[PDB]
Design a binder for this molecule. Structure first.
Ligand SMILES: O=C(O)c1ccc(Br)cc1O
Ligand SMILES: O=C(O)c1ccc(Br)cc1O
Length: 129
């Protein structure tokens, strides 16, 4: 894409040790699957394209970008060592939205619907085995 958007977050790095855990499997097969198909998922399914959206200040404000397209790749390509890393990526995505946008805004209400679902699912994150 555009040189004016940053490169996306890292999804592949052989130097980073990787592991499958039952918790990570749940994050893919339950959590991500649920949020991805939500009616309000589409703004969060790829990095924010600040050029196309005419938001030239977006990456001036948001210095830790994250999105569900990145998280999906990270889960499908086994990037993580543990569930906390992946939960932190979800939380970063929500908090970016809430920091950049006004509390009324449609994108915020969309993020909040996904976050409510997320919380319900994370409360049932299985014990690590
Ligand atoms: O099971 C599937 O086919 C599937 C498809 C998309 C996503 Br996101 C999660 C899934 O688990
Ligand atoms: O600025 C944002 O947070 C944002 C993200 C994705 C889309 Br699509 C529109 C937006 O306004």
């Amino acid at each position: 894409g555009s040189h004016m958007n940053p490169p996306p977050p890292e999804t592949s790095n052989p130097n980073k040790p990787k592991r499958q855990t039952n918790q990570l499997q749940y994050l893919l097969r339950v959590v991500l699957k649920t949020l991805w198909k939500h009616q309000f998922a589409w703004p969060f399914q790829q990095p924010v394209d600040a050029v196309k959206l005419n938001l030239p200040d977006y990456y001036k404000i948001i210095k830790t970008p994250m999105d569900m397209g990145t998280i999906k790749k990270r889960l499908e390509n086994n990037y993580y060592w543990n569930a906390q890393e992946c939960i932190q990526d979800f939380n970063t995505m929500f908090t970016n939205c809430y920091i950049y946008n006004k509390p009324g805004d449609d994108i915020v209400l969309m993020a909040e619907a996904l976050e409510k679902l997320f919380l319900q699912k994370i409360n049932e994150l299985p014990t690590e085995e």
